[PDB]
Write a structure and sequence with these properties.
Two copies of one chain form a homodimer.
Chain A: E1 4-9, E2 12-19, E3 28-32, H1 39-47, H2 50-58, E4 61-65, H3 85-89, H4 92-98, E5 104-109, H5 111-122, E6 127-133, H6 157-165, H7 168-173, H8 176-188, H9 191-202, E7 227-233, H10 239-246, E8 254-259, H11 266-269, H12 271-285
Parallel strand pairs in A: 3-4, 3-5, 5-6, 6-7, 7-8
Antiparallel strand pairs in A: 1-2, 2-4
Helix pairs in contact in A: 6-8
């Protein structure tokens, strides 16, 4: 049913898990998780969902785990030159090659969404679709003006990442979802290693995507060539960014999905609704008639 | 590099024009023109355009001419039972069968867009994509050439009566057998509601039925269609649908602005994975 690989790249080992058996012409639904998650935390709930299972039947699922984020990962030595976001994306063609895959339908969350998007800009041949959840193509704001002070380099990691995931009101309520995902961030990931991955995602440069004007397309400023499903909860802190990302992609190949009564982790909070959206998206490309 | 066929169906002959040789698994780009046009009037301008030629290259093109609307068509006897819009759509599977075509990427205008939309609802597996130009999915509720001019061109556009409009008066007037054109107009004005309805991601929505293919709705900012085309968009699945309002444009976007619409169509094809 499942098969783990530790794949060697010029930027270090990356751990991937292939559940289901890849097919001749069919692409694999490839997965990159967000900061403070691994593949298991981010999507295992979503891909185990009854309706999604009928989709994962036809496609093989290759879960990528960002370097050092894989469960039971050893700490990198303090000097360690953890890969840049751009570099993390340069690890994926090796992954595809090693598993003899020809193309992928990506599903990314935050850091994942950026990585897969960079990857798809770098390698349009290997990307057919992207479902980008809570994606931010702009570089991290040096300050959030909706706060009481600035204290960037002297606050807890787990609390930073929680904030990145969950809306202000959702986080203050501190319900089973938040308590559950404090514990996931604190215990499931190597805290030493996680700091490096966080730092990589916080250092991300601007994607550079710009929507083209159909008339007089001379400059042809680059965007994603593939079909894209941008997904964000109404109450995700991401909404500002995800709408901006949509403002910079080709509307003929892009759809925005603002999920109702939703915050961080739409794929776990409302997997029933997101599945059906993914199903329509796949049907667009000609799969799952 | 073209071939004409008169294809006899249960509901009568339909004249089609295949330019290019069909591939085994690639769909053909199939065409259905609007009231008061034929494929030449409606699409010849667009499909010959430089940038489109490089697309049409990799697909076969199959141009359908609505009954009696094809060039040199003889007038049907006065009693003649002209096909309903629903019937006109039922004539397409036979066209596909007889030319041994497996599936199509449809480009419709007005009546054409309804007909190809009806077709897709009836036979989803056969439709892979639809470029619906100036489509109207609702029912309507003297001089025929003037009526049709009005259907096509914006009020301001039409009052200005420039090269485009005086060219297309003559097209409507002299290209198509006038007896037949009335019957076709009658069929399009009788069109029933498509009965598409946008699905709610939570409600299963069994009763509601929508196009299951990738759709590019196209209208010019000044087209009388705009209200209807936006209506259409509001009733299709947003995950499989894009609305394209074309700047400084009225009737016949595909003629007025082929450069823009080509580019749109190329990205729409790239969405489904073709012309990589």
């Amino acid at each position: 049913d499942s098969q783990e690989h530790d794949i060697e790249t010029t930027h270090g080992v990356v751990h991937v898990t292939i559940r289901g058996l890849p097919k001749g012409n069919r692409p694999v639904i490839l997965t990159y998780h967000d900061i403070g998650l691994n593949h298991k935390s981010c999507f295992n709930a979503f891909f185990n969902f009854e309706d999604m299972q009928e989709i994962t039947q036809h496609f093989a699922v290759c879960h990528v785990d960002a370097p050092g984020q894989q469960e039971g990962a050893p700490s990198f030595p303090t000097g360690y030159q953890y890969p840049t976001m751009d570099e993390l994306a340069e690890m994926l063609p090796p992954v595809l090659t090693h598993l003899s895959l020809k193309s992928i339908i990506g599903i990314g969350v935050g850091a994942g969404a950026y990585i897969l998007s960079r990857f798809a800009l770098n390698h349009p041949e290997l990307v057919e679709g992207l479902v980008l959840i809570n994606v931010d193509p702009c570089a991290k704001g040096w300050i959030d003006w909706a706060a009481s002070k600035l204290s960037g380099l002297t606050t807890n990691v787990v609390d930073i990442i929680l904030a990145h995931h969950f809306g202000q009101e959702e986080l203050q309520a501190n319900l089973d979802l938040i308590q559950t995902y404090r514990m996931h961030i604190a215990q499931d990931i190597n805290q030493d290693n996680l700091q490096l991955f966080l730092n990589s995602y916080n250092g991300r440069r601007d994607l550079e995507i710009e929507r083209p004007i159909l008339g007089q397309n001379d400059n042809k400023s680059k965007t994603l060539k593939c079909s894209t499903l941008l997904v964000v909860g109404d109450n995700s802190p991401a909404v500002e960014a995800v709408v901006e990302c949509n403002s910079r992609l080709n509307p003929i190949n892009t759809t925005l999905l603002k999920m109702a009564d939703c915050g961080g982790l739409p794929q776990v909070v409302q997997p029933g609704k997101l599945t059906e959206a993914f199903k329509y998206f796949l049907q667009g490309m000609g799969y799952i008639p």
